[PDB]
mmCIF file of C-alpha atoms in Angstrom:
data_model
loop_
_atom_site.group_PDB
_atom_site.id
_atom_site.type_symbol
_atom_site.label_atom_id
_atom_site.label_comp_id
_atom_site.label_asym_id
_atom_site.label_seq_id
_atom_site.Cartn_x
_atom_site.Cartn_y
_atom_site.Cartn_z
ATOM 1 C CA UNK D 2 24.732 -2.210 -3.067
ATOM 2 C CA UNK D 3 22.255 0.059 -4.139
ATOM 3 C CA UNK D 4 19.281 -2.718 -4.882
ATOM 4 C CA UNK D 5 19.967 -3.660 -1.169
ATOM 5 C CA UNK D 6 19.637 0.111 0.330
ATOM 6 C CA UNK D 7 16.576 -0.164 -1.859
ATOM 7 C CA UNK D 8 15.025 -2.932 0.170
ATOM 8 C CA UNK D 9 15.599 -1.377 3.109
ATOM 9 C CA UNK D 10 13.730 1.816 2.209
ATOM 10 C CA UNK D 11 11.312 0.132 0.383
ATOM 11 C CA UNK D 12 10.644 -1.827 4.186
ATOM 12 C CA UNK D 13 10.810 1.164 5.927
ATOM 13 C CA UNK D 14 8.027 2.606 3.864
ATOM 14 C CA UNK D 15 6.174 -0.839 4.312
ATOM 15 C CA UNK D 16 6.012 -0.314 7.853
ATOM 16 C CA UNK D 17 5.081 3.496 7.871
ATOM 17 C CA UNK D 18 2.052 2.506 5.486
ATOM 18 C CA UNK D 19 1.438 -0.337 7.852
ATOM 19 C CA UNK D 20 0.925 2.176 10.771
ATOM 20 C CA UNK D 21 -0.811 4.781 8.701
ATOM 21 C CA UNK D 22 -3.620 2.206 7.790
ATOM 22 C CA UNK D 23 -3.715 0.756 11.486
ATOM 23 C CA UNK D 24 -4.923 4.325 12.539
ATOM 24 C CA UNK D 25 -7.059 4.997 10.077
ATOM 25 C CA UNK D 26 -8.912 1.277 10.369
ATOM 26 C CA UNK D 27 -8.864 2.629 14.520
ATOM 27 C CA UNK D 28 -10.323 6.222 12.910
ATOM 28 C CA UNK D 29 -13.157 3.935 11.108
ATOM 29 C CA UNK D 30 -13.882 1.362 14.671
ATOM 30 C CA UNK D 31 -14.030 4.207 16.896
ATOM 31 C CA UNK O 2 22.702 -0.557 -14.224
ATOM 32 C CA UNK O 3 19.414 -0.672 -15.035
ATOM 33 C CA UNK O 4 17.882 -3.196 -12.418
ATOM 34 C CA UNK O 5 19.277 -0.554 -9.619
ATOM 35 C CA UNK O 6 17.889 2.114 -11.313
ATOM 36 C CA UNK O 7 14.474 0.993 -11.680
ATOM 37 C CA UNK O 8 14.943 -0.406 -7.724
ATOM 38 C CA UNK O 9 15.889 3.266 -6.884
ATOM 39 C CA UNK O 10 12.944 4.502 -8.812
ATOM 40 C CA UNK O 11 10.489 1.845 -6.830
ATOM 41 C CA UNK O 12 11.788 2.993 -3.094
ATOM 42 C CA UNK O 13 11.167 6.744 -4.179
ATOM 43 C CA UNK O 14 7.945 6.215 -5.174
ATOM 44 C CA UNK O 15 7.079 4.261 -1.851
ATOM 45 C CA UNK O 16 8.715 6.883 0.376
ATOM 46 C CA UNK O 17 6.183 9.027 -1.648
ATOM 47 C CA UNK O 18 2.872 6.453 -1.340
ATOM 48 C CA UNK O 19 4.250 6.928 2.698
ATOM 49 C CA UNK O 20 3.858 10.639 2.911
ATOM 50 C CA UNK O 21 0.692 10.542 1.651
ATOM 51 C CA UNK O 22 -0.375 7.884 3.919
ATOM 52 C CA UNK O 23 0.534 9.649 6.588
ATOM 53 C CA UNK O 24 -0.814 12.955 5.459
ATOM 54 C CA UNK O 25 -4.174 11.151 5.304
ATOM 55 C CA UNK O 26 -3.761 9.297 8.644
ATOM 56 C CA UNK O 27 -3.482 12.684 10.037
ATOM 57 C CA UNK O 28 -6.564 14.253 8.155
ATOM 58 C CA UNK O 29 -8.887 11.358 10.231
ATOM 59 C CA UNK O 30 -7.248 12.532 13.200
ATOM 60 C CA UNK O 31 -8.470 16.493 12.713
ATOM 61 C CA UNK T 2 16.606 -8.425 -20.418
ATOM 62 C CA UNK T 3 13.210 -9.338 -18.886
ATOM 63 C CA UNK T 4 14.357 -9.619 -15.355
ATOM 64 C CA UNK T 5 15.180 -5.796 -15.928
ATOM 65 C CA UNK T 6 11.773 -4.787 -17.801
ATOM 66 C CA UNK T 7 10.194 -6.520 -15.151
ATOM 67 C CA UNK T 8 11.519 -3.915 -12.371
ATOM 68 C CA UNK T 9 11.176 -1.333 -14.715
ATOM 69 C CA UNK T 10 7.238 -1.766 -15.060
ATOM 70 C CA UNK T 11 6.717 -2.108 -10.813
ATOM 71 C CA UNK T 12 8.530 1.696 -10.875
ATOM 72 C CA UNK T 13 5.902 3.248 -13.313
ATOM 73 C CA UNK T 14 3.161 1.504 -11.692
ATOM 74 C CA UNK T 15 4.059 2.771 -7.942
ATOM 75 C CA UNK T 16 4.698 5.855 -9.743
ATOM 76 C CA UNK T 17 1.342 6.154 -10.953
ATOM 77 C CA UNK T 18 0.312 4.769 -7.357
ATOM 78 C CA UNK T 19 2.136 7.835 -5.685
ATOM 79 C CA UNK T 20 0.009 10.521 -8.024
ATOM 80 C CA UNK T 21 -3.104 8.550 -6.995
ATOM 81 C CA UNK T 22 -2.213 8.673 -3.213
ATOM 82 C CA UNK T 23 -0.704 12.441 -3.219
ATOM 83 C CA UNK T 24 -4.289 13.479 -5.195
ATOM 84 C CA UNK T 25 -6.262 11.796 -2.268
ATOM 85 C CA UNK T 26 -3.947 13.704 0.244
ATOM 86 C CA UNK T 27 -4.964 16.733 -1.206
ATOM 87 C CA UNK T 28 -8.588 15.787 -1.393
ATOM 88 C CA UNK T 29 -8.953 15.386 2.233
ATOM 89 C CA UNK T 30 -8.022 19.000 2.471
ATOM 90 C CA UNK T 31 -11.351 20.274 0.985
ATOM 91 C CA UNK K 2 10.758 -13.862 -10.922
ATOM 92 C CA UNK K 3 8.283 -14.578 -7.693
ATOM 93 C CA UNK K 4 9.097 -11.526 -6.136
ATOM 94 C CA UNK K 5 8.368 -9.187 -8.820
ATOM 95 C CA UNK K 6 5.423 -10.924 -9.051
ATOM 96 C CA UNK K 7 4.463 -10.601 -5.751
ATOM 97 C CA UNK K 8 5.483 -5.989 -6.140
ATOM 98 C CA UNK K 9 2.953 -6.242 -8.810
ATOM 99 C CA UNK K 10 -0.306 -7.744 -7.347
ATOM 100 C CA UNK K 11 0.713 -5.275 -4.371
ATOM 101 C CA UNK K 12 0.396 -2.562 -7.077
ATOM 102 C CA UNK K 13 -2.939 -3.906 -8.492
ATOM 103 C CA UNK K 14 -4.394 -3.809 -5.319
ATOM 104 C CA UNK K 15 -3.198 -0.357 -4.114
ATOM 105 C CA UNK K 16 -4.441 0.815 -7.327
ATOM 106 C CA UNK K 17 -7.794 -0.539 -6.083
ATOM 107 C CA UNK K 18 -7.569 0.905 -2.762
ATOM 108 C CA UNK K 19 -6.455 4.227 -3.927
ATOM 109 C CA UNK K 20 -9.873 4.010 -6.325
ATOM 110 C CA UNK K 21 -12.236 3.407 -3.030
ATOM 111 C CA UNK K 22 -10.008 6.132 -1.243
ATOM 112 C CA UNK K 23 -10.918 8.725 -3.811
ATOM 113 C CA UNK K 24 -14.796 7.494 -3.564
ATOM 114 C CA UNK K 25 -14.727 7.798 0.201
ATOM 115 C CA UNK K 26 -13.212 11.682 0.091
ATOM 116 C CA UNK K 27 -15.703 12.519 -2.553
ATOM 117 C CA UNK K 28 -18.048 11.276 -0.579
ATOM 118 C CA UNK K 29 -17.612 13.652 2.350
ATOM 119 C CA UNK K 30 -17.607 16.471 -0.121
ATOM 120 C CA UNK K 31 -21.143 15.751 -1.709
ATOM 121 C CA UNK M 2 13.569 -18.418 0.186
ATOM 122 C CA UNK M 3 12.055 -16.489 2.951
ATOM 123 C CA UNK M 4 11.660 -12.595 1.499
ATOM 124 C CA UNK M 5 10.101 -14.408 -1.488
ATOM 125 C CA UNK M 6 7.387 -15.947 0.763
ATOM 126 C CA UNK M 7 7.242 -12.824 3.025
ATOM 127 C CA UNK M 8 6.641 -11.017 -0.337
ATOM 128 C CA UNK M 9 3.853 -13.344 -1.026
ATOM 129 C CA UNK M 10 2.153 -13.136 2.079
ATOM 130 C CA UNK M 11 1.981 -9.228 2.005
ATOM 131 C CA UNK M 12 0.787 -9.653 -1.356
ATOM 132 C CA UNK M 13 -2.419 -12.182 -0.140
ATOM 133 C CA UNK M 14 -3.094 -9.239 2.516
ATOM 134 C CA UNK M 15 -3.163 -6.541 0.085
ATOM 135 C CA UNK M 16 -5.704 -8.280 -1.751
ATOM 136 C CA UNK M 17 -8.109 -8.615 1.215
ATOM 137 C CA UNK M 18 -7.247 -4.982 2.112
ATOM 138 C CA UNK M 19 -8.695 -3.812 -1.424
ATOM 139 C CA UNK M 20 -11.492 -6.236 -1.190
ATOM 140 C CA UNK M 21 -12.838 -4.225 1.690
ATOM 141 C CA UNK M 22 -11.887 -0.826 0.530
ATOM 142 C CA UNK M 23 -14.288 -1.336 -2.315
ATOM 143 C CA UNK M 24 -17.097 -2.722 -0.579
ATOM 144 C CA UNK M 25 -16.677 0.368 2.233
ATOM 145 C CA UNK M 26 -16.682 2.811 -1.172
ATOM 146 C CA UNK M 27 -19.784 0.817 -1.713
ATOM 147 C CA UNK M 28 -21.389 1.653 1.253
ATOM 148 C CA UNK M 29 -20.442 5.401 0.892
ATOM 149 C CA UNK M 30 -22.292 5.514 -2.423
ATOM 150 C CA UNK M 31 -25.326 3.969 -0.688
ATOM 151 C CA UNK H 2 19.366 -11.632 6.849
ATOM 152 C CA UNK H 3 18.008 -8.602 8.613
ATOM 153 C CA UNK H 4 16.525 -7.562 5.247
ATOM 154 C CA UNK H 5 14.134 -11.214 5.304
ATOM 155 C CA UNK H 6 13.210 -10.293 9.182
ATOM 156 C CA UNK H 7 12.145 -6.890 8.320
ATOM 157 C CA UNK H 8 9.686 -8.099 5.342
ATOM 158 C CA UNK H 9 8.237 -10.760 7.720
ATOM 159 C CA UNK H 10 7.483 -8.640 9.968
ATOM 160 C CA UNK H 11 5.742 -6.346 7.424
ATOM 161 C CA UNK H 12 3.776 -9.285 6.407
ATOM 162 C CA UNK H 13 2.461 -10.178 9.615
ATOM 163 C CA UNK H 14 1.430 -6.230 10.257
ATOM 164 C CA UNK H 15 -0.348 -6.394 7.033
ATOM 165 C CA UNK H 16 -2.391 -9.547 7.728
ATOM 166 C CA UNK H 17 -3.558 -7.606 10.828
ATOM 167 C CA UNK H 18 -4.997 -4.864 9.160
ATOM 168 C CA UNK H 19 -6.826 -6.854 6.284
ATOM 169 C CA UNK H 20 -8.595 -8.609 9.404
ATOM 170 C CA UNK H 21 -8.967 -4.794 10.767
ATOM 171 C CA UNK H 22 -10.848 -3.905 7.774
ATOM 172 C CA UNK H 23 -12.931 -7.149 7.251
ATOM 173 C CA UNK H 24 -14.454 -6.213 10.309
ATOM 174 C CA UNK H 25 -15.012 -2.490 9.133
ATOM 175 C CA UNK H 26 -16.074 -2.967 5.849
ATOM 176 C CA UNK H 27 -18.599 -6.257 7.198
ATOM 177 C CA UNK H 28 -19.667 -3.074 9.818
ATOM 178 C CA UNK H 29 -20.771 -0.671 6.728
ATOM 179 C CA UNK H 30 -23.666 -3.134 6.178
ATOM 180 C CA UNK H 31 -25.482 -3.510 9.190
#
């Protein structure tokens, strides 16, 4: 389905924003 | 119909917020 | 009906949250 | 229902964050 | 019932995620 | 499903990096 295929990019991009933030908050400690 | 449209509208505009997140990630690392 | 408008309203906000995000990508730059 | 719920306080606040975001890069240009 | 409650969760974080962007825009103004 | 996995693990990243930036943004005051 297409609202399912959705969702899973939607994740995906949950996760590269996740990462993105975790090195900037590492940019910010260090 | 329209619920999968607006669902494909949400995951481009996340892939999008992603780029950007990971443009600026890279900006705090030089 | 609402379940639809509903969607509909999350894609134009993460739209205007994927302006916001590219601006800041491009504000880094400078 | 609860999850669009849920895709819009995550907007709300990435509205916010993209608002400090654009503070902070101003910042480090004066 | 569980990507409804993962949704909610992510949703609590984002709101402590803003919280500190704007008091680290804060700080940047003075 | 896989789908429900994927968002609970984005949750848990996410609570991560609102404690990240608790301790970054309480660090911006002294």
């Amino acid at each position: 389905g297409e609202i399912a295929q959705a969702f899973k990019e939607i994740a995906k991009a949950f996760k590269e924003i996740a990462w993105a933030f975790k090195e900037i908050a590492q940019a910010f400690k260090g």
